[PDB]
């Protein structure tokens, strides 16, 4: 088992710029037949890996020349001459010189773009859910950058920490932004005992928190 070691683990890089991912192996990857079987793959979220470079520097069908590979023995580099917004994903180096075949740990390509404010939307529980005695109030904080953001739920001005579920999307390949949904779940009973529900977000793009509330009188 040949250990493949990738560096760095994550790589923030702006569109247009150059990017290089490194990969070291525990043993030389040169086969007794002269060839060096070091390859490179890209895996986009929810998809299977896709081959870019095989045998150090050859490109797979349709792969563009912005991608070049280089290296020798145990050290290898994958270079992207100029980064597009579609390059984001995880990159793995793999070897098939030695049995068993081994993959690296991956390097996540993160696109650095301009700061963007999240557009928040607040949704009250649906009649259909109330009917079952449950009540989830939801908050979407869409299309923002950086990923760093804070959300506080407030009921009649009182902060609620328990019962909130937070989920973030991977960086969007379309505009390099992130989205997040924060769900506060209550009983139908507790929901009915109050008036205004507030979703408060704290992001570096705003001095004051970005706020979204609804009062039960719609």
């Amino acid at each position: 088992d040949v250990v493949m070691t990738q560096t760095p683990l994550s790589l923030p890089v702006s569109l247009g710029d150059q990017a290089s991912i490194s990969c070291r192996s525990s043993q030389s990857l040169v086969h007794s037949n002269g060839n060096t079987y070091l390859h490179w793959y890209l895996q986009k979220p929810g998809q299977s890996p896709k081959l870019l470079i095989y045998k150090v520097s050859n490109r797979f069908s349709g792969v563009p020349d912005r991608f070049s590979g280089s290296g020798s023995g145990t050290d290898f580099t994958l270079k992207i001459s100029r980064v597009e917004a579609e390059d984001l994903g995880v990159y793995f180096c793999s070897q098939s010189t030695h049995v068993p075949r081994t993959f690296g740990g991956g390097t996540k390509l993160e696109i650095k773009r301009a700061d963007a404010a999240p557009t928040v939307s607040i949704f009250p529980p649906s009649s259909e859910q109330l009917t079952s005695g449950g009540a989830s109030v939801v908050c979407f904080l869409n299309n923002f950058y950086p990923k760093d953001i804070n959300v506080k739920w407030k009921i009649d001005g009182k902060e609620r920490q328990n019962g909130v579920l937070n989920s973030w999307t991977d960086q969007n390949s379309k505009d390099s932004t992130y989205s997040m949904s924060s769900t506060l779940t209550l009983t139908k009973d507790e929901y009915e005992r109050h008036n205004s529900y507030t979703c408060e977000a704290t992001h570096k793009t705003s001095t004051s928190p970005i706020v979204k509330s609804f009062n039960r009188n719609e």
Binding site: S48, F92, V99, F123, S126, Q129, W168, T169, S179
Partner: protein, 208 residues
């Protein structure tokens, strides 16, 4: 076009066994060896083994010698045995030879004693602006995954699918779509939720 068709999901009880399939199209099945790779959330991939369709000769990685067995014919199969929570992962069949490199879609393997549970779908409509964001909350299902599409997937430009979280031993996720404010509610948008594990397909129409 070369195409490797795999399953999708599998729920199995601990200690049980299982057998995944891989249909090979678009090429001479017999010309290349069939590989199997495993991948769990923490991205790292691990090679399991390979089989030669021509003579059905086999080669396995030691760590899976005592877990998997491969068979063939244009289909290739891999069987796992004595499943545990660690065995929960995505499994891939693939032809990995230089420039002939083709992967299957991967079969998700969930080992759980848990009961297959259908999702409840609730529409999220606002309680002002140039754009209006609508949503659908898909709560309480098992196992993963679910597929939310809008207007049968013809509305795909401004969609956000949020990853599922475990809530009370049952999954919950939401999906959102943003449309011109002048188009809703005049035109209706509907989220379609598919949970194949429970052979479910629910549609939710968004109304004010």
């Amino acid at each position: 076009q070369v195409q490797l068709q795999q399953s999708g999901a599998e729920l199995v009880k601990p200690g049980a066994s299982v057998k995944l399939s891989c249909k090979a199209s678009g090429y001479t099945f017999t010309s290349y060896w069939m590989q199997w790779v495993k991948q769990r959330p923490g991205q790292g991939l691990e090679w399991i083994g390979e089989i030669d369709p021509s003579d059905s000769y086999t080669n396995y990685n030691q760590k899976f010698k005592g877990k998997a067995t491969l068979t063939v014919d244009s289909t290739a199969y891999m069987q796992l045995s004595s499943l545990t929570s660690e065995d929960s992962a995505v499994y891939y069949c693939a032809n990995l030879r230089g420039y002939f490199d083709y992967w299957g879609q991967g079969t998700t393997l969930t080992v759980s004693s848990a009961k297959t549970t259908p999702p409840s779908v609730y529409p999220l409509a606002p309680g002002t602006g140039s754009s209006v964001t609508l949503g659908c909350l898909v709560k309480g299902y098992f196992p993963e995954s679910v597929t939310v599409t809008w207007n049968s997937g013809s509305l795909s430009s401004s969609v956000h699918t949020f990853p599922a979280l475990l809530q009370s031993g049952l999954y919950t996720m939401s999906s959102s779509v943003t449309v011109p404010s002048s188009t809703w509610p005049s035109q209706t948008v509907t989220c379609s939720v598919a949970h194949p594990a429970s052979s479910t397909t629910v549609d939710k129409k968004l109304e004010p």
